[PDB]
Amino acid sequence: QLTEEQIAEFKEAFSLFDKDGDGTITTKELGTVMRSLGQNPTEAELQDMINEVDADGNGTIDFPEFLTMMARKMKDTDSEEEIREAFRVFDKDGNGYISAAELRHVMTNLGEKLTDEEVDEMIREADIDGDGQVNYEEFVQMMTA
């Protein structure tokens, strides 16, 4: 089931996929979107993504097939464990802590990065005890509460 406001917002979402704005999502458009999210689906996987939603078998996804499909997967779940696992990547000694210095080293060099100033705001919240150490299980629990 979907509400009036959700149907309207999902029309806007359909434009994130229908790149040329021709009313249909092709395997080519899904490939571009997936790669823009740092994924690399094969041709068969893109075809499978279309075929699972394509109820009339014309090779593309239209807005009703897209909407019908969103209705089936509305349920969300909390991301606490996955986020904790991402911090664990940077827990060199596997002791449940990342120092404020290591957090800066990570955040100013890896991925999209934060400025040293943004790192300061993050550490001010993360370092609850003011000991220069982040108990990341506790910090993630705080952000997902």
Partner: protein
């Protein structure tokens, strides 16, 4: 809003499942017969069916992994669509 929450988790793949699953049944039976229902174990026969058994089991593992991959790709697109709910 949704904040940090995310979506809760083919004819060719179906054919890969049915053939691999039938072969798991085939080889489980032939290993069983050749190790427990014979007077004298023929080790060459056991090695042959162990090779066919591991290939069928591993083919089913491969399909299941591909289905998990396809499911997360679909959930990625659903998650992107759900950003418009904010």
């Amino acid at each position: 809003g949704r904040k940090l929450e995310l979506t809760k988790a083919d004819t060719q793949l179906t054919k890969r499942v049915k053939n691999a699953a039938a072969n798991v049944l085939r080889e489980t039976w032939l290993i069983y017969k050749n190790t427990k229902l014979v007077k004298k174990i023929d080790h060459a026969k056991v090695r042959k069916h162990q090779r066919k058994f591991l290939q069928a089991i591993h083919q089913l593992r491969s399909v299941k992994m591909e289905q998990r991959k396809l499911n997360d790709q679909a959930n990625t697109l659903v998650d992107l669509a759900k950003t418009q709910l904010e």
